[PDB]
Every structure is written in C-alpha cells, then in structure tokens.
C-alpha cells in the first residue's frame, strides 16, 4: 500500500449527512450530477491518489527537481511526471472548471473534497495542475478577445503561475517594483525580478505556461492601488489557433532548496532580462490588478487549508495503523506485575490521548473547510443555510483566513503527535510522517504568513464588515447551544463558554482599535492579540462542528446503525466530547490574556532582545 491513507467515509458524512449538499445535486447548475455519481467520483479520485499519485511522493523528495542553467528550465523526476500524466489522463485537472471550458459543474464543497485526496497523496501534483482554474479566472476578468486565449489555455491544459512576490515585496505586496512599459502596439514590456514563484517552470509537462504577473505601469502611483495584472505567456502563440510560437522573455534563474515540498519547483523568475522582452497583455485591458488577483488569492487560501488538513489526516491514519500493531509495555493497570502480558500501544492512555487529539483536529478541520465551501456557491448556501448571495460571500470571506491560518498552524502542530506515536521509528525516513511535517511547514507562509492572515481576518473580515458575517456564524453556534439531546448537554455548556470567550476577545480587541484614535499605540495590542484570536475562533468553530456531527451521529445510532457505520458514529461522539473538554477550556485563559495585553513589549528597546 502507499503512504496515502484516505477518508472518503468522513467526507461523505460531512457532505451528505451533516451539510446536505445532496439537496442541490441533480437540479439546475448541477443537473448533470447526482449524489451517487458524486460518491463514485470521490471513491475514484481517492483510489487514484492512493495509487499513481502517491507512488511518486517519496521520489519527488529524495530526487528533487534540478535547475538547468544551460536552458533556464527545471527537470522533474520521471516518477512524478508519470503521476502528473495519471492526473491529466483522468481529467481531474478540470473538476469544478466551468462547463464552457470543458469542466464538470459541481458544488465547490464536492470539488475541494476531491482535491483533498491529491493534496494528501502528493500535494505538488495539484499545484502544477492549477492551470485550468487560473485560465478560468483569466477568462472571467478578460476582454472578449482575451477570453478566446483563456479558452485555448484551458483546453490545451497550459500550466499557470501567480507572480507577485519580489525580494523586497512579500507581505507588503504594494511595495512591488516590477515595471510595465506600454508599447506602441498596446502590449506591455514587463521588467523585473520575482521570487518564490511556484511552478514557474515545469519541465515538459505542458506546452505553455500562463504567468499572471503583477507589475506597476510606468508613472502609476504607489502601493497596491498602482498595481496592474498582466498575462505573460512563456511562449508567444497564435491568438486564434493556439499554435505555439516564439519564446517570450520570462525565464527561471534559480530553483530554491527548501525544507520540504521539494518536488514543487519554487523559482526566481526574471522578466525582460535575458535578451528578449517579456511581452504582457493588460488583463481586462483595465488597471485593476489587486482586485483581479482576488479570486486567485481565495483559491490559494482554500488550497493551503485543504492541503494542511489532507496531510494531517493521512499522518493520523498512518499513526493509528502503526499504534494498532505495535506491542510495547504492560497495561497501566498491571504496572506492578512484571509477568503481565504486553499490550498494543493503543492501550496506553497517553497514546489514546494523542490519537484522539489528532483525530479531532483532523475531522474538525475537514468540517471547517467543507462548511466554508457551502458558502462558495449561491445555490448551495441558499439550499443548506437559507442565506442570500451577498451574506454567503461575506461569510466565505470571513472563513477563508480560518481555513488557511488556523488550518496551517494546527496541522503542522498536530503532526508532531502523529510522529510521536511511532516512537523512534517516526524520526525515520522509512515512514512518511517526517516528510509530512517538512511538506507542511510551508502552509504558514504560502499566500501570506499567519500574522497577515490574522490581521486580514480582524481588520478586513470583521471590522470593515462591521461584524455582520461574524454575527451570522455566532448566531448559528448559539442556535445549536440553545437547541434541546441530554447526551450533548455538557458539550453545549462548554461551547457556550467558548462562544462567550471568543466574544470577549473580539470586544477587547475592538476596544483597543477604537481607542487608537485617542492613543495611536493602542493599535499595537490588536497586533499582539490577532493571531491568538484567529486560533481561538478556529477552535470554537472546530468544537461547534464536531458537536453538530455528534448530534447527527446520535440520531444515526438511535436509528439502528450497525457494524463499521456504528463504529464511525461512536468515534464522532467521542471526538466531539474530547475536543470540548480538552481543547475549548483553554480559550478562557486566552481571553484573560488578551484582556490584559499591554504595550511593554512594544516600548522595549530593540537592543534589549
């Protein structure tokens, strides 16, 4: 078997027993897709992920890509290219792509449940396959002429990149200095150096790459508002037929040596510096780059959060299988009897504590991203939540920093428990967990650091939104708390305390921000507390959704579930209760810490660190 251990059963439970995404299946935009077909698609990609995609997971890390300075190209290991061909040959790079581009219409919740498997098995494979989806974004923002090129790009399976970051412009995107110079023929010459560009070359996987490049037109003003977005293809091509023509002046100059995710080629990218111009076309023929890059942003944040949970999930299931088989020590009830039978380590309290921590966070994160995705289709949000399109969009916007920020921080931290369950063997490359950890560290950095996520969440998704999306979610949690089984009373009580705790954090932080008008330095306490607040909201949402799942599991058990279903439902009840009693209470101390924040660390001389 491969390293990759999937959990289709938990995805189906979320999609169909908890959130009810099957209500929209078979009607209107999803007329061509029934629930049975959705279930079969999930089983099928899970098998693909466990087979040919996971097949090259180890090889891509042990035999990583090599930059060739003689040609300014990257060479990828042959086994990974075999995996990519399996993904393309099955049409999986076109799941959730618009029908007019050749895609299969489906709810975003189903789409991300399918992508979870590729991210768990070999996450760089999904990254290299994000071309069609970026072509769709270019389609939606382009002129009528540009839509014709985007159609070509989608149908020919070109690769794509998102090209923002520069040596001195990473978190501060508005500081970019890459330049765009308008030409007499209405094209632009793009000039500058970009850094950390994922998939900037990809060997012979594709016949072209579409680079979407942020750059500052000559004479444009400063900051984010002065940035425009350009379509910059690796090769010139015939704008009617798609025939590949002459090389365009956009070249990789290095491939980074990274801790993990090694088979994803992460490149320094030079535009206009190797003898020929980097010709670009202004997207939509309008100057609106950051706003056009928005749906790319949102996609990248969902991808990172799904990746984090995908990897935690397979890390947990690998640890669990190991623990079931490993014999070590006597039962703690027999510590004093040195004739006692040896037991499998799932009999040890600390190991069960570790495994339940891993399980609860893995399942809680899965529920979070699928919950989030039910707000990404107007149809689904109306059907499953009764929410209209504007509020659904604002709730999605609120949740994405949680999916990304909380997910990225939690998965890496809980994989520590996964490795620990194997004992010394977890430190070995023979088992996949050490690579999961290395591959997962990037999650807190890619598409904006955790602190940027947490600042965006508070300043933009709460304060600027005047709290409307947050109020909606809080009201859903309160409705669950106030609904009247007795087997979930203590969970509901712990959730009520956690809800009050997060509300108190929000109010303290909001006070610090509003007081900044009188005392400017007050705002620093918002920065000091932002990440802890984001993580507290993640824990609340986790606990609430686990409890919701436990409520469905109780109904299903009372209705007579048996066998492997019964075991699944009992595990949901156990994980919800464990999380409520062991993770949620810590938010009370965090609330008090945030209520007691001060400016001393800001006033300290830098020379004192």
Ligand X SMILES: Cc1cc2nc3c(=O)[nH]c(=O)nc-3n(C[C@H](O)[C@H](O)[C@H](O)COP(=O)(O)OP(=O)(O)OC[C@H]3O[C@@H](n4cnc5c(N)ncnc54)[C@H](O)[C@@H]3O)c2cc1C
Active site residues: 447
Q: Of the two residues 98 and 561, which places its CB atom closer to a second copy in the complex? A: 561
According to DSSP, the residues that pair with 166 across neighbouring strands are 169
Q: Which does 376 bind (CB under 5 to 8 A by kind): a second copy, ligand X, none?
A: none
For residue 281, the surrounding DSSP H or E stretch is: strand 278-282
Output the CA torsion sign for 507, 510, 514, 519: positive
Interface with a second copy: number of residues (CB under 8 A): 104
Binding piece for a second copy, criterion CB under 8 A, among 42-50, 107-115, 267-275, 415-423: 415-423
> Binders of a second copy among 527-586, rule CB under 8 A?
527-528, 530-531, 564, 567-568, 570-571, 574, 577-578, 581-582, 585-586
Alpha-carbon distance of 83 to 129, in angstroms, equals 11
Q: Which does 198 bind (CB under 5 to 8 A by kind): ligand X, a second copy, none?
A: ligand X
Among 134, 162, 293, 368, indicate the residue that binds ligand X (CB under 6 A).
162
Q: Which does 510 bind (CB under 5 to 8 A by kind): ligand X, a second copy, none?
A: none
Reduce the DSSP state of residue 196 to 3 states and report it: strand
Question: Which of 268, 305, 365 lies closest to 69 in space, CA to CA?
Answer: 268
Alpha-carbon distance of 141 to 231, in angstroms, equals 11
Among 23, 29, 287, 348, indicate the residue that binds ligand X (CB under 6 A).
348
Alpha-carbon distance of 479 to 24, in angstroms, equals 24
Reduce the DSSP state of residue 390 to 3 states and report it: helix
First to last CA, the chain: 50
> What ranges in 51-97 are assigned the alpha helix state H?
57-62, 78-89
As measured in angstroms, the least distance from the Cβ of 244 to a second copy is 32
What single string gives the DSSP state of each residue in 22-64? GGGTTSGGGTT--HHHHHHHHHHHHHHIIIIIGGGHHHHHHS-
| Residues with Cβ within 8 Å of residue 350, at least 6 apart in sequence | none
Alpha-carbon distance of 263 to 133, in angstroms, equals 21
As measured in angstroms, the least distance from the Cβ of 540 to a second copy is 14
Structural tokens at position 33: 């897709």
* Interface with ligand X, residue 451, by CB under 6 A: yes
As measured in angstroms, the least distance from the Cβ of 111 to ligand X is 21
As measured in angstroms, the least distance from the Cβ of 189 to a second copy is 26
Q: Which does 162 bind (CB under 5 to 8 A by kind): ligand X, a second copy, none?
A: ligand X
Main-chain dihedrals φ then ψ at residue 191, nearest 5 degrees: -135, 115
Phi-psi region of 366 (alpha: psi -120 to 50; beta: other; left: phi over 0): alpha
Site string for a second copy, 489-528 (x = CB under 8 A): ---------------------------x---xx-xxxxxx
Contact present, 346 and 323 (Cβ < 8 Å) = yes
Phi-psi region of 153 (alpha: psi -120 to 50; beta: other; left: phi over 0): alpha
Site string for a second copy, 149-188 (x = CB under 8 A): ----------------x--x-xxx-xx-------------
Among 34, 243, 350, 519, indicate the residue that binds ligand X (CB under 6 A).
350
As measured in angstroms, the least distance from the Cβ of 269 to ligand X is 9
| Residues with Cβ within 8 Å of residue 126, at least 6 apart in sequence | 115, 118, 119, 303, 307
Alpha-carbon distance of 545 to 363, in angstroms, equals 9
> Binders of a second copy among 451-480, rule CB under 8 A?
451, 454-455, 459
* Interface with a second copy, residue 350, by CB under 8 A: yes
Q: Which does 466 bind (CB under 5 to 8 A by kind): ligand X, a second copy, none?
A: none
* Interface with ligand X, residue 438, by CB under 6 A: no
* Interface with a second copy, residue 242, by CB under 8 A: no
Site string for ligand X, 299-338 (x = CB under 6 A): ---------------------------x-xx---------
According to DSSP, the residues that pair with 68 across neighbouring strands are 73
Among 129, 265, 419, 540, indicate the residue that binds a second copy (CB under 8 A).
419
* Interface with ligand X, residue 417, by CB under 6 A: no
> Binders of a second copy among 314-343, rule CB under 8 A?
320, 324, 327-330, 332-333, 335, 338-339, 342
Binding piece for ligand X, criterion CB under 6 A, among 174-182, 344-352, 385-393, 556-564: 344-352
DSSP conformation class of 248 = P
The angle that helices 131-141 and 294-325 make with each other, rounded to 10 degrees, is 160
* Interface with a second copy, residue 355, by CB under 8 A: yes
Structural tokens at position 567: 């075991």
Q: Of the two residues 27 and 521, which places its CB atom closer to ligand X in the complex? A: 521
As measured in angstroms, the least distance from the Cβ of 229 to ligand X is 12
Among 413, 463, 496, 561, indicate the residue that binds a second copy (CB under 8 A).
413
* Interface with ligand X, residue 382, by CB under 6 A: no
Q: Which does 164 bind (CB under 5 to 8 A by kind): ligand X, a second copy, none?
A: ligand X
Question: Pairing mode, if any, of strands 209-217 and 159-163?
Answer: parallel
């Amino acid at each position: 078997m491969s390293h990759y251990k999937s959990n289709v059963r938990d995805q189906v439970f979320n999609l169909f027993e908890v959130f009810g995404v099957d209500k929209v299946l078979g009607a209107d935009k999803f007329s061509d897709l029934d629930a049975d077909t959705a279930r079969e698609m999930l089983t099928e990609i899970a098998r693909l992920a466990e087979g040919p995609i996971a097949e090259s997971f180890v090889e891509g890390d042990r035999n990583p890509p090599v930059f060739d300075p003689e040609t300014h190209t990257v060479t990828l290991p042959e086994g990974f290219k075999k995996s990519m061909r399996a993904l393309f040959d099955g049409g999986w790079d076109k799941v959730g792509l618009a029908e007019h581009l050749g895609g299969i219409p489906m709810p975003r919740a189903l789409q991300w449940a399918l992508i979870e498997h590729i991210l768990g098995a070999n996450p760089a494979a999904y990254m290299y396959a994000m071309g069609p989806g970026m072509s769709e974004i270019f389609y939606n923002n382009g002129t009528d002429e540009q839509k014709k090129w985007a159609t070509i790009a989608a149908e020919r399976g070109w690769g794509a990149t998102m090209v923002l970051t520069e040596p001195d412009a990473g978190s501060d995107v508005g500081a970019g200095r890459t330049k765009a110079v308008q030409q007499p023929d209405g094209t632009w010459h793009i000039e500058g150096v970009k850094r950390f560009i994922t998939s900037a070359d990809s060997d012979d996987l594709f016949e072209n790459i579409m680079h979407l490049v942020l750059a500052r037109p000559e004479g444009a003003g400063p900051g984010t508002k002065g940035l425009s977005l350009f379509f910059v293809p690796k090769f010139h091509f015939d704008h009617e037929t798609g025939e590949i023509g002459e090389r365009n002046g956009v070249f990789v100059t290095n491939v980074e040596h990274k801790m993990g995710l090694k088979v994803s080629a992460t490149c320094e990218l030079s535009l206009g510096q190797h003898g020929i111009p980097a010709v670009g076309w202004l997207v939509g023929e309008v100057h609106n780059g950051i706003a056009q890059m928005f749906d790319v942003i949102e996609q990248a944040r969902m991808m990172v959060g799904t990746k984090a949970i995908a990897t935690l999930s397979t890390g947990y299931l690998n640890a669990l299988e190991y623990a079931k088989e490993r014999v070590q020590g006597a039962d703690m009830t027999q510590m004093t009897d040195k004739t006692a039978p040896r037991v499998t380590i799932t009999h040890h309290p600390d190991v069960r504590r570790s495994l339940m921590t891993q399980k609860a966070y893995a399942e809680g994160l899965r529920a979070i991203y699928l919950y989030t995705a039910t707000f990404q289709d107007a149809e689904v949000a109306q059907a499953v939540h009764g929410v209209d399109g504007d509020l659904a969009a604002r709730v999605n916007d609120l949740l994405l920093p949680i999916v990304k920020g909380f997910g990225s921080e939690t998965a890496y931290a809980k994989l520590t428990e996964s490795l620990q369950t194997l004992g010394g063997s977890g430190f070995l490359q023979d088992y996949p967990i050490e690579q999961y950890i290395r591959d997962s560290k990037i999650d807190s950095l890619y598409e904006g650091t955790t602190a940027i996520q947490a600042q965006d969440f508070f300043f933009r998704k709460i304060i600027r939104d005047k709290g409307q999306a947050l109020a909606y979610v809080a009201g859903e949690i309160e409705q669950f708390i106030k609904n009247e089984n007795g087997r979930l009373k203590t969970e509901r009580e712990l959730l009520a305390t956690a809800l009050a705790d997060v509300q108190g954090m929000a109010a303290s932080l909001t006070g610090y921000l509003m007081a900044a008008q009188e005392d400017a330095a007050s705002i620093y306490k918002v920065g000091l507390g932002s990440v802890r607040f984001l993580m507290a909201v993640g824990d609340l949402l986790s606990g609430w959704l686990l409890a919701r799942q436990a409520a469905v599991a109780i109904e299903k058990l009372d209705a007579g579930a048996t066998g492997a279903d019964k075991s699944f439902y009992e595990g949901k009840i156990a994980a919800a209760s464990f999380f409520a009693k062991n993770m949620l209470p810590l938010l009370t101390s965090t609330r008090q810490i945030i209520e007691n924040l001060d400016n001393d660390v800001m006033e300290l001389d830098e020379a004192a660190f």
